[PDB]
Amino acid sequence: SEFDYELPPELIAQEPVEPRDASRLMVLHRKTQRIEHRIFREIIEYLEPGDLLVLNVSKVIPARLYARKGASIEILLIERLEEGIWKCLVRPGQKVKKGTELVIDEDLSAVCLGRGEDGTRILKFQPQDDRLIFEKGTAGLHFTPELIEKLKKKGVQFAEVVLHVGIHEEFYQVPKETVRKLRETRERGNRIVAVGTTTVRTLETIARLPEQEEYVGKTDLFIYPPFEFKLVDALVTNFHLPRSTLLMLVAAFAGKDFVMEAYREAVKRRYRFFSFGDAMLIL
Amino acid sequence: SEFDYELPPELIAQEPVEPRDASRLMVLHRKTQRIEHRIFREIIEYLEPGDLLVLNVSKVIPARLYARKASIEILLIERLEEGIWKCLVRPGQKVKKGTELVIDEDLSAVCLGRGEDGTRILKFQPQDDRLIFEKGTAGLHFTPELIEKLKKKGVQFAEVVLHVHEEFYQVPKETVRKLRETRERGNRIVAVGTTTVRTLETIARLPEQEEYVGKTDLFIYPPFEFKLVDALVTNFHLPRSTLLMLVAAFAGKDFVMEAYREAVKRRYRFFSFGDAMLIL
Structure with missing residues (x-):
């Protein structure tokens, strides 16, 4: 070499x-x-x-979650904006836009608040509890x-x-x-x-x-x-x-x-x- | 190779x-x-x-000390009890049972003898590990x-x-x-x-x-x-x-x-x- x-x-x-x-x-x-x-x-x-x-x-990546809309969507947490509000990588992402609701458990859901210029999705979890989110992922x-x-x-x-x-x-x-x-x-x-x-x-x-x-x-x-x-x-x-x-x-x-x-x-x-x-x- | x-x-x-x-x-x-x-x-x-x-x-080695009887290096190896340590001492032929060594006005030692491994046992005066570590x-x-x-x-x-x-x-x-x-x-x-x-x-x-x-x-x-x-x-x-x-x-x-x-x-x-x- x-x-x-x-x-x-x-x-x-x-x-x-x-x-x-x-x-x-x-x-x-x-x-x-x-x-x-x-x-x-x-x-x-x-x-x-x-x-x-x-x-x-x-x-x-502090949590990876699978969700349903009912397509089966993967969510990867990238950046926390606020307790229970995260920029996420969502795949398949074409599905997810502002207002899109996503269910993980009976105990955890998320609503999309928008899309980043970088291709991420801003998701607000319900409830807005990071410990729960991490537990679920x-x-x-x-x-x-x-x-x-x-x-x-x-x-x-x-x-x-x-x-x-x-x-x-x-x-x-x-x-x-x-x-x-x-x-x-x-x-x-x-x-x-x-x-x-x-x-x-x-x-x-x-x-x-x-x-x-x-x-x-x-x-x-x-x-x-x-x-x-x-x-x-x-x-x-x-x-x-x-x-x-x-x-x-x-x-x-x-x-x-x-x-x-x-x-x-x-x-x-x-x-x-x-x-x-x-x-x-x-x- | x-x-x-x-x-x-x-x-x-x-x-x-x-x-x-x-x-x-x-x-x-x-x-x-x-x-x-x-x-x-x-x-x-x-x-x-x-x-x-x-x-x-x-x-x-938790302390290295210089002393005179003149000029002796002391390296602490193993604590037997408070203020009594197996030590490596250089030069060693000059340190026998009963040899006194002054470090400072604040710290002295006497050699109690040698163990089976050849190390010198030093009893410090005072018998106080913190002081010894300070000085070394x-x-x-x-x-x-x-x-x-x-x-x-x-x-x-x-x-x-x-x-x-x-x-x-x-x-x-x-x-x-x-x-x-x-x-x-x-x-x-x-x-x-x-x-x-x-x-x-x-x-x-x-x-x-x-x-x-x-x-x-x-x-x-x-x-x-x-x-x-x-x-x-x-x-x-x-x-x-x-x-x-x-x-x-x-x-x-x-x-x-x-x-x-x-x-x-x-x-x-x-x-x-x-x-x-x-x-x-």
Whole structure:
């Protein structure tokens, strides 16, 4: 493989450094081809006021319910708006519109209050009781609260994307506030800095869809070199394993020969790899 | 490398399964060369009453102190009672029964002698642990529930300790006793983890004592005679790792490499949060 490299097994970290921002940070400057060897908390020296750090948050879908209208409809809870009012993924959704009533039990029903621009259904449960409803149904970890506070003091902004995990089945969500911030950051001429490869795949997926105010969906996107990044200007990520698809994505972002040179230097300098290891910033 | 195998990166686990004993368990029977594919909680089906599971517990040394009699380093190892500790003392030849050592104006110690494991027993003055402290994964597959069932079946448990650059093992009196008793009954000493293996096979090569504390330099690779360990529970190790060499010594190299190739084929999860192997 073009993405194979020799990784001494002892460099795969079993536990993280403490504090988390005392991990190593290799910085790659793509246009100049400069590589630097830093510590994570020094990431602030690369960020300017107005840059946007986008983080992914992975959430387990807190209930899956089957209902009847009498078609048999699946309901997946995505986002709570209020006790007993949730944005939901409803399948088959073509059936469900404002006013549609859905019965789960003798003890639980729901009325559709509307449809999101993202394709979800806003459902009000009867009764509005989340406990009943539930009954019926790592790159970011280098950032410490102290670092996040320093960054915000410098004028760096934050946004989040979400990965909703069903259980196999994963839905991304890019909420309205994140869509607005991405657009504002671009307008200001600042950088969208993705934190983690999950964030990258979500953002490059929505960059290729028609414009919406908010997005929810599934992504199949496979990123492999050469690839044009439409939304992501910079990337914080871990050191990935030989032949991994994550290494292929980062190679597309940084340039294959450059990232392979960087990984050979990381092994030589005894960086730690994988989920509890060190980090890379690609600018 | 004789210890290389192709491991798809996606098989290296980032997180453990829950509950812990729902991970896969591959079982290797050395004499018959049989290989089975089980779940961890089923390990009880391979253990009999009187078998001994030996687990390693890692403990950070709870105080490191410098004293003068001049210049002495003191590492706390084991509390006998309040203010009386088995200690590692460096340099040790200079500390004998009756040696006094001052840490501060606030804290002194006297050496009461040496135990059978060679550690120095220090009585501190005052006898006050808080003051003294001021001045200075294979086993995770087991759940509390499984442990309870194993104990109800008559399987016994013992501990070895690793006191932590710079690591000292301890095999306490109660473990030495159970090792011997187990052997006397003709039951199996079952090592949980390669750390346990290294400790037990170290002390097996030493003059007999009732308790041990020391540093191990033992490096296990094929062929090796296991003098204490009758069976092993361990994770799936990475290509070319020294841990894989150790397990190849325990299982036999060709047998273990066949097992690992089958593990990949069946998409077992590898490394510290992955599945497990029992070698009998």
